[PDB]
């Protein structure tokens, strides 16, 4: 099911009239998939799928649909309806969320830990991946370099 990740890869990347550029970043990934007294897995980066909690320092977020963004006060507050891929991706200045075809971006400086559990496929990322973008003849291509 490729599709899903290019999918994804193009909606991301929308990039100006005549771009070919590597798009670095903690994408999705097709290597492990998984599929389940709840699971815990370490060291992640990002975290997409088809109750998750991420654990952090003063704050941390959750998705029940609801998504929400608190300490142990609010930030971030989000109710939505349900080839749609959804995650979450997170670094030291902010957490950008992936719901229902749009893309949210939001800005503070959190310590996070890499301790992630849950309560459905499940697509965790570890490590950079590399796509090429490139939409010079009017069509966005997507592919590997
Ligand atoms: C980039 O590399 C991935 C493998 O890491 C390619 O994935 C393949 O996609 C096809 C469907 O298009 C599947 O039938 C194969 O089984 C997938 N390979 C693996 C190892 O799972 C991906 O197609 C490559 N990108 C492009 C544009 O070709
Ligand atoms: C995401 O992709 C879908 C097509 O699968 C499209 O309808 C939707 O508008 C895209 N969202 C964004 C933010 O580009
Ligand atoms: C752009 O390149 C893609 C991939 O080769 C091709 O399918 C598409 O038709 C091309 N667009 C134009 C206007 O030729």
């Given at each position: 099911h490729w599709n899903l990740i290019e999918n994804f890869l193009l909606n991301y990347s929308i990039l100006p009239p005549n771009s070919d550029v590597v798009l670095g970043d903690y994408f999705?990934?097709?290597?492990?998939?998984?599929?389940?007294?709840?699971?815990t897995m370490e060291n992640?980066?990002?975290?997409?799928?088809?109750?998750?909690?991420?654990?952090?320092?003063?704050?941390?977020?959750?998705?029940?649909?609801?998504?929400?963004?608190?300490?142990?006060?609010?930030?971030?507050?989000?109710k939505f309806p349900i080839?749609?891929?959804?995650?979450?991706?997170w670094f030291t200045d902010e957490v950008v969320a992936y719901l229902h075809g749009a893309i949210y971006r939001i800005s503070f400086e959190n310590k996070w830990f890499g301790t992630v559990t849950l309560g459905w496929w499940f697509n965790p990322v570890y490590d950079v991946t590399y796509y090429r973008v490139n939409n010079k003849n009017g069509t966005t291509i997507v592919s590997n370099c």
């Open positions: 999705p990934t097709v290597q492990p998939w998984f599929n389940c007294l709840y699971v992640l980066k990002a975290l997409y799928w088809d109750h998750v909690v991420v654990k952090g320092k003063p704050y941390s977020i959750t998705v029940t649909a609801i998504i929400c963004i608190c300490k142990g006060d609010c930030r971030l507050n989000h080839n749609m891929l959804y995650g979450l991706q």
